[PDB]
Curated annotation (Swiss-Prot), chain A:
Organism: Severe acute respiratory syndrome coronavirus 2 (2019-nCoV)
Subunit and interaction comment: Binds to host ACE2. RBD also interacts with the N-linked glycan on 'Asn-90' of ACE2. Cleavage of S generates a polybasic C-terminal sequence on S1 that binds to host Neuropilin-1 (NRP1) and Neuropilin-2 (NRP2) receptors. Interacts with host integrin alpha-5/beta-1 (ITGA5:ITGB1) and with ACE2 in complex with integrin alpha-5/beta-1 (ITGA5:ITGB1). May interact via cytoplasmic c-terminus with M protein. May interact (via N-terminus) with host bilirubin and biliverdin, thereby preventing antibody binding to the SARS-CoV-2 spike NTD via an allosteric mechanism.
Location of region: Disordered: 21-43
Role of this protein: Attaches the virion to the cell membrane by interacting with host receptor, initiating the infection. The major receptor is host ACE2. When S2/S2' has been cleaved, binding to the receptor triggers direct fusion at the cell membrane. When S2/S2' has not been cleaved, binding to the receptor results in internalization of the virus by endocytosis using host TFRC and GRM2 and leading to fusion of the virion membrane with the host endosomal membrane. Alternatively, may use NRP1/NRP2 and integrin as entry receptors.
Residues of the full protein shown: 499 to 547 of 1273
Protein name: Spike protein S1
Taxon lineage: Viruses, Riboviria, Orthornavirae, Pisuviricota, Pisoniviricetes
Length: 49, 47
């Protein structure tokens, strides 16, 4: 504990993204909103718009 | 894809004369190389 900040331990985590011919598997989330009816609304239903 | 129908009579000569629609059951997302096919059988012992 008596050492300075320069000599203090630091935990380091390294992430490494890569792209291949795979169909993409591990990517992030998609959020959704409420559902409205009987109104003229542009929509994006699972890729159909 | 898969379906099933009965035939009653075996007649091990040819496939039945009938139309059938082949409904999907499952989809698989792994894209590994496939070039050859092999099958299995259920054989336990002489009986
Ligand atoms: C199999 O893998 C090779 C990589 O050595 C690739 O060139 C080829 O497109 C793949 N598919 C087939 C059907 O050979």
């Amino acid at each position: 504990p008596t050492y300075g900040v320069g000599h203090q331990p630091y935990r380091v985590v390294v992430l490494s993204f890569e792209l291949l011919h795979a169909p993409a598997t591990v990517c992030g989330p998609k959020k959704s909103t409420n559902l409205v009816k009987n109104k003229c609304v542009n929509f994006n239903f699972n890729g159909l718009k | 894809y898969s379906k099933h129908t009965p035939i009653i009579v075996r007649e091990p000569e040819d496939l039945p004369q009938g139309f059938s629609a082949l409904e999907p059951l499952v989809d698989l997302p792994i894209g590994i190389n496939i070039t050859r096919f092999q099958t299995l059988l259920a054989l336990h012992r002489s009986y």
